[PDB]
Design a binder for this molecule. Structure first.
Ligand SMILES: CC(C)N1CCC(C)(C)c2cc(C#Cc3ccc(C(=O)O)cc3)ccc21
Length: 138
């Protein structure tokens, strides 16, 4: 019965500021984002391979809708419009490759995985730098 669906509570965050730095976010905006990202609300709805994911903070909210295997548009973690495509790497792990709509920048991606223990891992990557965030349902 359990899947990616849930209201998810963060329990661990690593390397978020480093990710924003590689993306070229300046010091003062990074400080704002890091603080706000420390207590996000995350809502996922899954129906088969169709997903809704809303990630909210006091300073910024993202809401994405996608089907695995079908291109969609969203934003990079630093706010730049991109084309995205999610695939199943494995049964419990989706991987999203991103391409900017305009300009150039680090190669970005994200992954979401349901681990053996019932928890969710999000990773966000820019070039070689990875941010890892772990959640449990509320
Ligand atoms: C200054 C501020 C408004 N600002 C401008 C710069 C920038 C776009 C980088 C930015 C990013 C965020 C974020 C985030 C976040 C990402 C993932 C999660 C998660 O999945 O848990 C939670 C939060 C917040 C503020 C913010």
């Amino acid at each position: 019965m359990p899947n990616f669906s849930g209201n998810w509570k963060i329990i661990r965050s690593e390397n978020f500021e480093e990710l924003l730095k590689v993306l070229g976010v300046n010091v003062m905006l990074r400080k704002i984002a890091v603080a706000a990202a420390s207590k996000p609300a995350v809502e996922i709805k899954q129906e088969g391979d169709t997903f809704y994911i809303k990630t909210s903070t006091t300073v910024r909210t993202t809401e994405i809708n996608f089907k695995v295997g079908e291109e969609f548009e969203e934003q990079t973690v630093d706010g730049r419009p991109c084309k995205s495509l999610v695939k199943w790497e494995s049964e419990n792990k989706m991987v999203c490759e991103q391409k900017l709509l305009k300009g150039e920048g680090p190669k970005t991606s994200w992954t979401r995985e349901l681990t053996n223990d019932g928890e969710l891992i999000l990773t966000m990557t820019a070039d070689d730098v990875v941010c890892t965030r772990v959640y449990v349902r509320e």
